[PDB]
Structure 1
Amino acid sequence: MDINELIIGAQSADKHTREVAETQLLQWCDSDASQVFKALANVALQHEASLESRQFALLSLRKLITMYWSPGFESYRSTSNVEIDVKDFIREVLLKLCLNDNENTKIKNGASYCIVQISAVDFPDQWPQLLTVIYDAISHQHSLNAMSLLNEIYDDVVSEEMFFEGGIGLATMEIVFKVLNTETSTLIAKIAALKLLKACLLQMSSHNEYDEASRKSFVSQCLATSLQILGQLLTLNFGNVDVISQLKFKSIIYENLVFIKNDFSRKHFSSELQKQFKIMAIQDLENVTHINAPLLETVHDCSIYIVEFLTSVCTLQFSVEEMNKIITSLTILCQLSSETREIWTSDFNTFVSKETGLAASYNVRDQANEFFTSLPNPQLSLIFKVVSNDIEHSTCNYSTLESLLYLLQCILLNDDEITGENIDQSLQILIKTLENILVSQEIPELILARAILTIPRVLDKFIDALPDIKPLTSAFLAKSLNLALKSDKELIKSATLIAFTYYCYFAELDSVLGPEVCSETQEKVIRIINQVSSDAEEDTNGALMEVLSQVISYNPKEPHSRKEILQAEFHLVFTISSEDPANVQVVVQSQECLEKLLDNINMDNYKNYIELCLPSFINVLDSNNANNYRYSPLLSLVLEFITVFLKKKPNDGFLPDEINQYLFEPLAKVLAFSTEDETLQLATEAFSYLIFNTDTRAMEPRLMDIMKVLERLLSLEVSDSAAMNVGPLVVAIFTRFSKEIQPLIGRILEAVVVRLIKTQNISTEQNLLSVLCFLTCNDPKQTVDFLSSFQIDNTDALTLVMRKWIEAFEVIRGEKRIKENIVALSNLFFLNDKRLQKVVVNGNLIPYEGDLIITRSMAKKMPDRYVQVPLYTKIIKLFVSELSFQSESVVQLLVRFFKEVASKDVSGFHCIYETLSDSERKVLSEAL
């Protein structure tokens, strides 16, 4: 017999035999899958075989099932399908292995996974007896692994009809309540039942019809009995027999009590029960922390749910004695483990990611934030007094001081305002304590980082009812920045930069610190960003841009601005962004920082910045030439910076000629040769601005080079996405070269019209309409003649283009483009061309009979239909709808259009007014 050789060959370490056995095995399956499946199932059932072979047999069946069992698995190879006779065999073998507690855990877990796969396909059509066998094992054989298996396949197999009406729901709760009421049941047996209780509660939480009287009542007795039982379980004590098991037991009880409290009506979990379990939860916090003499992880995993319950019943009044127990217990659960202290100290980028709120980990430190952030004001005020009091007494205990400062940070993050007369006394002592921490020379690293981060919260929360707040803000901000500078810890440097962001949230440092100190803090923050930007990584570079944005926002606009700082801000925008161009958050913020560095710029100042920056840009554009301008994340970045530099033009006329001399050729080469979609989109955007904003006299010799670029973009393998910005480029060329372009307008416009008709891309048609609306404003008559004479698919372009224009009007973006198109359509309306009267465009959408949702599968027999209306009629309705949504300027424009037209009834406006809807006339009456 062969399967033993394959099992040994496949299980062996050497790859050569592993593939031979696997390829031989798969080849055998492709011919007699039934025989291979039968063999693997006889190798897993045989106890005489070694555990390694038995485990591997179930390990192989795990994968072979997905490939040879049913088409329901995407991995089905369709070579052969195990005969139904063989299926009934292994499906029997798997249940025997899984439901037998005497089997090894690997065999029980190995077979359990196979049943999970099979049951999701074979139940109930091909495996009717699955649940009958599982419930037989639990009820009669008292199998523990049967409850573990039943939990895994519960949601997949038991439907609402099976659960409520089918008796599976009541059958399970009887099993659950029998186990929990049996005081002699082992913890592993009670834990299994409580996990299975969570499966039932999930079924009862939501179901297809709440109003069913039989379902509504059945839920009531189940929840009422659950809370009765869960109360009994929390009263039990097992000593130190097994703390890891007891902690899991408490975890599942509180997971169930946080579900019953949150995913059910207030009726089912009353306040008197909330008070009863609130007292138990606080006492479990004391018990859980005292048990902490993988124990710690289970202590922290259990504490997440105990605190998650307290967050739910946080509205209940906490006694002063109970607040002490919560703070004392959280001070021990919210302190950083030695493992996390090492992680943060060794790599400060992990500290910044967690502090910035971007780390994926969620632990007790985050559930304590959710608890303190949820408290109401009557309790939040009293908690602060407890936390503040503990700090002034724990100031000399560095073991707990960091934890307490975090609880204080969570309290001060609450949206409610802390009030009460005594808080004035506690606050002043708290402020002095924080100052001592900063001044302390021997303070540990992470306590100092937390004190730096908590101080902004204290000032923000008590911005009012705090004398001399401004001196404190200057005193604290200066002290925290100094600590960052004279320290070799990058964690403290990044802690101060994050703290600086919090300072700017509540305080206008320009008005608080003053013109001189504000510039000094800008210098200090810029120095700190340089120090940490050297080793910044991952989410740190995103944070540094956010901080740098704040620094840039405070640079003076008044004369005698610090030119040294501005050159340092420019250097940081490129340096931080150049480090990780692919980072999206840095890319967007880098442009924002660059834009606000150029919002108001003089000629002399602008020339200096382009002189410093442009030479780097030229090299990046030229460097990518050898790569055929493929999608380099750095190449995109500079093309986005060039656009910002070119878009934010200085006052006093056009851009300096140097830009035309140096950027024109690199950009032209990018557009001529590059094939990437993103590169062409950005390059065309930058090139369009270059032509638009540069002096015509200095660009005329380059007019020929533009056309080779333009003609290469109009029609080629260049997709519609790649030629997204060709609309503005054609507008820019037409605007600055209108006299020289007169011969070439016809062939340029013809290509644009064809592109507009074919493209379904919202952004491409919006841009390509920028050419038409520009031409219509320039000469509405001429545009129609070009469209009337030109034909696509043997029909006039006018009907096709105008219909595209009308549909595109509904999704145009930007006030500039909405004003432009409103003017363009208005010019067509005033023209009253006879050819424009024969075009018919889609009006209101005719709904089909009934209320059926028309999914795309129904498009064949329920296509969208529109009432055909004359174009001029749809133009007026479109403008009316624009005024309605809005409910010199867009509204101003549409209103003057309605006034001028009404004063003369041009183009039959009187007739259109008569056929408009009554609601439209009411809106139109705002102008009339």
Structure 2
Amino acid sequence: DINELIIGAQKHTREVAETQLLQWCDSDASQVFKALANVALQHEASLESRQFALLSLRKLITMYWSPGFESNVEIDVKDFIREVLLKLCLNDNENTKIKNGASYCIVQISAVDFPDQWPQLLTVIYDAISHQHSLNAMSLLNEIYDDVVSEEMFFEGGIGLATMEIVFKVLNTETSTLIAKIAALKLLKACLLQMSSHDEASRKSFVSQCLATSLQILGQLLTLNFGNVDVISQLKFKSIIYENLVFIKNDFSRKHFSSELQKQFKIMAIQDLENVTHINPLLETVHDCSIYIVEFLTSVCTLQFSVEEMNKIITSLTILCQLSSETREIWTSDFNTFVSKETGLAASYNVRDQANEFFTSLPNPQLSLIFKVVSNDIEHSTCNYSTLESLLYLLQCILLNDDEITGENIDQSLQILIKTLENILVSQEIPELILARAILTIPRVLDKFIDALPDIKPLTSAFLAKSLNLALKSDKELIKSATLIAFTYYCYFAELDSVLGPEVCSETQEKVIRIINQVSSDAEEDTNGALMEVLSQVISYNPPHSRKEILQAEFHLVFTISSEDPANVQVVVQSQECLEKLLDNINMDNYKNYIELCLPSFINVLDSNNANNYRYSPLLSLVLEFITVFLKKKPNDGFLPDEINQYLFEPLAKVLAFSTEDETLQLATEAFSYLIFNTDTRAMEPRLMDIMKVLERLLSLEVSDSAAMNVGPLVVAIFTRFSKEIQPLIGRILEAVVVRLIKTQNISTEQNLLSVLCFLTCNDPKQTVDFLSSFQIDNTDALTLVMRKWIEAFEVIRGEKRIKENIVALSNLFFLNDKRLQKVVVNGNLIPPDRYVQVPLYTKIIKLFVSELSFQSKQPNPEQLITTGLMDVKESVVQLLVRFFKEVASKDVSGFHCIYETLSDSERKVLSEALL
């Protein structure tokens, strides 16, 4: 049965069984496992079937073992399955796919079962390591550690001390294999991690002693000198030692790593940086090893470095930071790879990155002195085109140290260094990657040394002009891109409109604009975002004295690049600022030309997106934001020109008539409302019947609750600008708001719509009560249902502006003294499936107002932060309430004398105190 039952499942024939069999276990699981387990136990099997048996087992377990998070199996078959798993996994002689397979099941069982359902799991593993010499048990312990050794088991449970003494025993034995010392060192790091997440007093003796023993053992370990016997394991040995050293130095206080211990390891580490580079797949074994050596030197880089120690370091990093020929070819074959790296947007982390962390960490006794060490090495290497890029990059790291560089004859050095960088860009047969590094390194020289170059103004203008000049007559987009990037490094420290001429600055705008236009045709994602950033800095330097064409070129770039990568986060952010700087502080006459330059592109995107039913589309969302940025840049004095309305209206309307996507509806709603609120009324006059159909549909059930909640400001806009002609359509606005409001049960959405209702009752309280007291909803008049829902919402409202607009609205209903309102009843008190004493609307309004006024005049809580809605109300809630009560008291409004005698004494004191 079961063996050839999966001979198939391990391609119609696979699923015959893979659900065939899943069936079985749900029927009887306890001895489909035992059957599955039994096949893994049997050495009489294709390592393939055994291996899949274990990994088929593997997935299986986390279902029926013990929920678990996605579930039936008997208690003594699991004891069997754990013991079979320990047999396979802890035996070094077994096949390393059986071991890992068995190790996978064990690690999942442990997660569910360990504390109380596998008590000896660790004592077995510890005994396997120390008395059965199991190497794989060390590996299982290491994968188990994170997820099953808790903080508490580590320290009081004795697991941390048991581990550390095992670790120490392997590393102090001259006869444990280097492979076993690696396993011990990886356990050591696991232990350091558990000790890094700490505070309780009884632990501090344990931690202090494990750190001290660790530091002495790692010192003796770094003095072994194997042969060429296995250098990939040799280098994985060294890198895990230096990784542990880094971790001790960085996550424990300095009493635990004395500066003299630091000085020993600094020396061993500088030596091993030399050893590792003078042997040198293998290269990323030695490259990744040297990352940890350098990481440690970074971590003790406040120590002093003998001059000779620094030349050692610089010659080793010069070799290590040289670009591999694979990476040179990737960069020269797709320049977007080079942009991705140099803009920091690459996921890589290599020796060059770690060197940058070293050089930008140096304090200033050492930082200035490496400066000439590298500056000499650059002079003694101007024709070695195998080390010069790397040396320039080390220079770049040093210059990125935020600290200043000064020393005995550093001005000498600089005039020398300045005077080989200009020969890089004049030199005509210079390799592409080295020219780019020189281009990107020049601004950082001029930035770091600006206070020590009297010629800084013409120096920069020439260096920059030379670089645009290469870039435009180089065919290499990598060189162009290095220049675009370098241009931003010049802006960082230099205000170009003053350091250059008004005329030259204007001509370097045109020159990076067309460099951008050359790179853009071939640009992928990270480098489109960098083009947008460059463009916005170009836009910054726009001249008052207008220039028709350069503006048109900038916006064309903004729009086409954004159409290329509308989901890239930098494109989205930088293009909106680009647009905000173009229409920043612009007059009405220029506005009229921007309308023709800008809007027809935006309407194309919206036109195209109807094909897609205005479903979510990142360029749609981005172009709607462009539109809103355009509208809101109109001169404060004036209306939107009439052209804006006739360009934008039925495009935006269509979006709102068909889209069902919350972000699209919300961005279009606010653009549309704003267009209605800010164009002349006679321009908008024929559109109102259409604005209504938009509004009715945004309250229909075709759109979500949160789409209904954007309607507020559209209602405002059509009253605020169709005041005369809205009056015969108020009844439809109201029916729309009302049928929606009663169909929703989300309290927050009710409030949003009640807000619109508050606006509508204030505008005409009678017509509201009339409509609502003639309009029928499910057999009864709306009046009762709405008012009850209104009151229930008012009771849990929040926000000063919301409270006021409801107070004003309901105050207007009270002052109606309406025959019909007086007769409706809302819910008062719970009576002991549930019931409530029925309360007249009117006296419930009084009751609620007195409670608000009681709470609101118990004056503030001492501490605070300092010193929405559709209607603007200036009075405090307290002022609104006292002015209301004073007036209904003064004239017996709507039976107030009756209501007021039904009030309690408590309520009644509140009333006459506030009215004192």
Name the TM tier (shorter chain): 0.7 to 0.9
- Residue 112 of structure 1 and its aligned partner are, at CA, apart by 1.2
- CA–CA separation in structure 2 for the residues paired with 1:884 and 1:287: 82
Give the CA deviation at 1:561: 2.2
**Could you tell me how far apart the structure 2 residues matched to 1:223 and 1:480 are?**
54
1:821-852 deviations in whole A, cap 9, x for unaligned? 999999999999999999999999999xxxxx
Indicate which of 100, 107, 125 corresponds to 2:98: 107
Contact 2:696 2:736 in 1 (8 A): no
- Change in Cα spacing, 1:434 to 1:712, as seen in structure 2 (3 Å) is same
Cα deviation for residue 780 of structure 1 reads: 12
* 1:704-719 alignment, distance < 5 Å: 704-719=689-704
Contact 2:310 2:370 in 1 (8 A): yes
**2:755 maps to which of 746, 770, 793:** 770
**Post-superposition offset of 1:443:** 1.2
Please state whether the residue corresponding to 1:722 is helix, strand or coil: helix
1:772 is displaced (CA, Å) by: 8.6
Distance 2:547 2:421 in 1: 33
Partner of 2:143: 152
Query: Could you tell me how far apart the structure 2 residues matched to 1:880 and 1:393 are?
Result: 89
Deviation at 1:267, TM superposition (A): 1.6
Q: Could you list the per-position Cα deviations for residues 666-690 of structure 1 after superposition, in whole angstroms to 9, with x for gaps in the alignment?
A: 2222212222222211221221122
Whether contact under 8 Å (1:725, 1:764) holds in the other structure is no
Deviates more, 1:228-237 or 1:353-362: 353-362
**Alpha-carbon separation, structure 2, partners of 1:874 and 1:305:** 74
* Cα distance, 1:908 vs structure 2: 23
2:66 and 2:81 map into 1 onto residues whose CA distance is 15
In the alignment, structure 2 segments of 5+ residues that lack a partner are 858-874
Higher alpha-carbon deviation: 366-375 or 907-916: 907-916
Contact 1:728 1:767 in 2 (8 A): no
1:734: how far off? 2.0
Partner residue in 1 for 2:46: 50
Relative to structure 1, the CA distance from residue 349 to residue 224 in structure 2 (aligned partners, 3 Å threshold; closer, same or farther) is same
* CA 406–897 in structure 1, closer or farther in 2 if over 3 Å, else same: farther
TM-superposed CA distance for 1:721, in Å, is 2.4
Which residue does the alignment assign to 1:142?
133
Higher mean alpha-carbon deviation, 719-728 vs 257-266, is at 719-728
- Please say if residues 649 and 693 of structure 1, whose CA atoms lie closer than 8 Å, have aligned partners that are also in contact: no
Tell me by how many angstroms 1:231 deviates: 0.7
Contact between 1:549 and 1:593, CA under 8 Å: does it hold in 2? yes
My pick for the range that moved more, 646-655 or 494-503, is 646-655
Q: 1:906–1:23: structure 2 CA closer, same or farther, 3 Å change rule? A: closer
Distance change in 2, residues 1:741/1:523 (3 Å): same
Q: How many angstroms does 1:651 deviate by?
A: 6.9
Indicate the structure (1 or 2) with the bigger Cα radius of gyration: 2
What is the rounded CA distance, in whole Å, between the counterparts of 1:306 and 1:146 in structure 2? 29
* Cα distance change on mapping 1:579 and 1:880 into 2, 3 Å: farther
Identical columns (%): 100
The change in CA–CA distance for 1:770 and 1:32 in structure 2 (over 3 A counts) is: closer
When residues 395 and 739 of structure 1 are mapped into structure 2, their CA distance, relative to the original with a 3 A threshold, is same
Once the 2 structures are TM-superposed, how far is the Cα of residue 56 of structure 1 from its aligned partner?
2.1
| Matched residue, 1:462 | 449
- Is the Cα contact below 8 Å between 1:402 and 1:446 reproduced in 2? yes
Q: Give the match's secondary structure for 1:886.
A: helix
Say if 2:847 is the partner of 1:877.
yes
User: Cα–Cα, structure 1 residues 576 and 141, in superposed 2: closer, same or farther, change >3 Å?
Assistant: same
- Shift, 1:204, TM fit: 1.8
* 1:604 positional shift: 3.5
Q: What does the per-residue CA deviation read over 1:195-237, in whole Å, with 9 as the maximum and x for residues that have no partner?
A: 1111112222224xxx544311111111111101111101111
Partner Cα distance (1:364, 1:921) in 2: 79
Q: Is the 8 A contact 2:660 2:704 kept in 1?
A: no
Q: Do 1:6 and 1:22's aligned partners in 2 also have CA atoms closer than 8 Å?
A: no
Measured after TM superposition, the shift of residue 488 of structure 1 is 1.5
Moved more, 877-886 or 250-259: 877-886
Alpha-carbon offset, residue 805 of structure 1: 13
Corresponding residue for residue 857 of structure 1? none
Structure 1 partner of 2:414: 427
Tell me whether 1:275 sits opposite 2:245 in the alignment.
Answer: no
Who is 1:542 aligned against?
Answer: 529
Is the Cα contact below 8 Å between 1:449 and 1:495 reproduced in 2? yes
* Contact kept in structure 2, 1:630 and 1:674, CA below 8 Å: yes
Aligned-residue offset at 1:179: 0.7
Query: Are the structure 2 counterparts of residues 160 and 865 from structure 1 closer, same or farther at C-alpha, using a change threshold of 3 Å?
Result: farther
Alpha-carbon spacing, 1:87–1:876, altered in 2? closer, same or farther (3 Å): same
Show CA shifts across 1:263-299 (max 9, x none): 112221121111111111111111111122x211111
Q: 1:586 Cα deviation (Å)?
A: 1.4
Structure 1 residue 794, shift from structure 2 partner: 16
SS at structure 2 position matched to 1:539: helix
2:8 is the alignment partner of 1:17: no
For the Cα contact (< 8 Å) 1:481–1:525, is it kept in 2?
A: yes
Report deviation, 1:154.
1.7
Decide whether the 8 Å contact of 2:212 with 2:256 is kept in 1.
yes
1:14-55, Cα deviation, whole Å (9 max, x unpaired): x12222232332233222333332222222222232322222
* Structure-2 residue corresponding to 1:886: 856
Does the 8 Å CA contact 2:539/2:578 hold for their aligned counterparts? yes
Give the SS at the match of 1:406. Answer: helix
2:73 aligns with: 82
Q: Is the 8 A contact 2:709 2:749 kept in 1?
A: yes
C-alpha change, 1:389 and 1:182, in structure 2 (3 Å) is same
Aligned mates of 1:388, 1:866 — CA distance in 2: 88
TM-score if structure 2 supplies the norm length?
0.83
Contact 2:90 2:136 survives alignment (8 Å): yes
The alignment's C-alpha RMSD in Å is 6.5
* Equivalent pair of 2:614/2:658 in contact (CA under 8 Å): yes
Residues in 2 aligned to 1:820 and 1:31: alpha-carbon distance in whole angstroms: 64
1:842 alignment partner, SS class: strand
**Cα pair 1:281 1:306 within 8 Å, conserved:** yes
Task: Out of 675-684 and 547-556, give the one that drifted further.
Answer: 675-684
1:339-395 alpha-carbon deviations (Å, 9 max, x no partner): 111111111112111211111111111111111111112221112222222112222
Q: Which residue of 1 aligns with 2:864?
A: none
Distance 1:451 1:469 in 2: 18
Q: Name the SS for the 1:760 alignment partner.
A: coil
Change (3 A) 1:761 1:658: farther
1:613 offset after TM fit, Å?
3.2
Q: Greater CA deviation, 486-495 or 790-799?
A: 790-799
TM-score, normalised to structure 1's length? Answer: 0.82
CA–CA separation in structure 2 for the residues paired with 1:322 and 1:774: 78
Change (3 A) 1:881 1:160: farther
Query: Of 189, 201, 205, which aligns to 2:192?
Result: 201
For residues 436-481 of structure 1, the C-alpha deviation after alignment (integer angstroms, 9 at most, x for no partner) is: 1111211111111111111111111122221111111111111111
Measured against aligned partners, the alpha-carbon deviations of 1:286-325 in whole angstroms (never above 9, x if no partner) come to 1111122x21111111111111111111111222111112
Structure 1 residues 412 and 894, CA gap change in structure 2 (3 angstroms): farther
Contact kept? 1:100, 1:143, Cα under 8 Å: yes
Report the Cα distance in structure 1 between the residues aligned to 2:92 and 2:681, rounded to whole angstroms: 87
Partner Cα distance (1:126, 1:731) in 2: 66
Q: For residues 366 and 775 of structure 1, do their structure 2 counterparts lie closer, same or farther at Cα, with a shift above 3 Å needed?
A: farther
Per-residue deviation at 1:555? 0.8
Query: In the alignment, which residue of structure 2 is the partner of 1:404?
Result: 391
Specify whether residues 883 and 128 from structure 1 end up closer, same or farther in structure 2 by C-alpha distance, changes over 3 A only. Answer: same
Please give the alpha-carbon distance, in whole angstroms, between the structure 2 residues aligned to 1:157 and 1:503.
53
Q: Taking structure 1 as reference, are residues 167 and 655 closer, same or farther at Cα in structure 2, changes over 3 Å only?
A: closer
The worse-fitting range, judged by mean Cα deviation, of 305-314 and 653-662 is 653-662
**Displacement after TM superposition at 1:146 (Å):** 0.9
- Counterpart in 1 of 2:614? 629
Q: Structure 1 residue 867: deviation in Å?
A: 24
1:695 to 1:842, Cα distance in 2 relative to 1, 3 A: farther
DSSP 3-state at the match of 2:380: helix
Deviation string 1:606-661 (CA, Å, 9 cap, x unpaired) is 22232233333333333333443222333333322222222222576333323322
- Going from structure 1 to structure 2, the CA distance change for 1:618 and 1:764 (only over 3 Å counts) comes to farther
Give the Cα separation in 2 of the matches to 1:885 and 1:431: 74
Q: For residue 409 of structure 2, give the secondary structure of its aligned residue in structure 1.
A: helix
* Rounded Cα–Cα distance in structure 2 between residues aligned with 1:916 and 1:348: 81
Return the offset for 1:523: 0.6
1:92 pairs with one of 76, 83, 98: 83
Asked if the contact 2:588/2:634 (under 8 Å) is kept, the reply is no
Tell me the distance in 2 between the aligned counterparts of 1:63 and 1:157: 19
Q: Secondary structure at the match of 1:202?
A: helix
Change beyond 3 A, Cα 1:765–1:24:
closer
State which drifts further: 594-603 or 182-191. 594-603
Offset of residue 662 of structure 1? 3.1
